[PDB]
Amino acid sequence: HHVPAFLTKLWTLVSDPDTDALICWSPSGNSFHVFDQGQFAKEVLPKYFKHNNMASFVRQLNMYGFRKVVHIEQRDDTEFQHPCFLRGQEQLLENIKRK
Amino acid sequence: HVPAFLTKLWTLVSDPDTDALICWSPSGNSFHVFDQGQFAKEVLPKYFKHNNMASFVRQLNMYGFRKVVHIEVKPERDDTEFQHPCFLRGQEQLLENIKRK
DNA sequence: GGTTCTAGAACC
DNA sequence: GGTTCTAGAACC
Ligand code: NA
Ligand code: NA
Numbered sequence: 399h400h401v402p403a404f405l406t407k408l409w410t411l412v413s414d415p416d417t418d419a420l421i422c423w424s425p426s427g428n429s430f431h432v433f434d435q436g437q438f439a440k441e442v443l444p445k446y447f448k449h450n451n452m453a454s455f456v457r458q459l460n461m462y463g464f465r466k467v468v469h470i471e472q473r474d475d476t477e478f479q480h481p482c483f484l485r486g487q488e489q490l491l492e493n494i495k496r497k
Numbered sequence: 498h499v500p501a502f503l504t505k506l507w508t509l510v511s512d513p514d515t516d517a518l519i520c521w522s523p524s525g526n527s528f529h530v531f532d533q534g535q536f537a538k539e540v541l542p543k544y545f546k547h548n549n550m551a552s553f554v555r556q557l558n559m560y561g562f563r564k565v566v567h568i569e570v571k572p573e574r575d576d577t578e579f580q581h582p583c584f585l586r587g588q589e590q591l592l593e594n595i596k597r598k
Numbered sequence: 599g600g601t602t603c604t605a606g607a608a609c610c
Numbered sequence: 611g612g613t614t615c616t617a618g619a620a621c622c
Contacts, residue, residue, distance in 0.1 A: 428582055456568060459568060460568040464568065465566065465568065466565070466566050467563050467564070467565060467580075468563065468565075468566055469558070469563060469564070470558040470562060470563060470564050470579070471554075471555070477563075479565075481526050
């Protein structure tokens with residue numbers, strides 16, 4: 399099936415080293431971080447996910463079955479992941495499904 | 498030398514006979530612990546005998562495991578998901594790369 | 599179960 | 611060779 403532009407855009411954005419101050423791969427490449435959501439919403443969303451806020455962006459991640467990664471024991475930092483959303487493996491996006 | 502905690506955990510997760518309480522995720526990238534009260538009663542005494550649930554989870558944290566949660570209806574039993582990029586179904590040799598953090 | 603002891607590894 | 615770290619065993 400055709401890979402949703404949402405996922406391709408998201409993957410390219412994460413993978414761009416120049417955006418890493420706001421969104422980047424984890425060291426393992428298995429997850430990605432979103433930093434400083436106040437800034438992320440002003441700088442990033444308007445250009446790559448037009449007419450979105452953080453809530454609608456995160457709703458889309460949930461729709462594609464992304465999970466959140468948190469520390470077991472307790473800038474803002476939120477970590478998301480999908481087993482087919484991986485550093486340097488864009489072709490795996492094909493295996494991501496709605497719901 | 499891989500710490501016994503990690504080798505025992507990997508074997509325990511992998512064992513189909515314990516899957517009602519502890520098992521791999523479908524992808525093999527994470528494991529689930531179900532029904533922690535029962536896990537503490539049936540599993541910990543046999544596999545991690547000097548531990549309680551708190552110390553078991555502390556050891557996971559010490560080795561850099563994280564928790565996986567849904568982006569936000571209660572399930573029949575509680576379900577906690579843990580993961581480490583070197584703790585994977587079918588890849589026990591990767592435990593060699595797990596370090597204290 | 600938490601703390602202490604120590605052999606041996608990790609790292610320089 | 612010297613220092614720190616770590617895992618397992620004893621001690622509480
Ligand atoms: Na980036
Ligand atoms: Na199991």
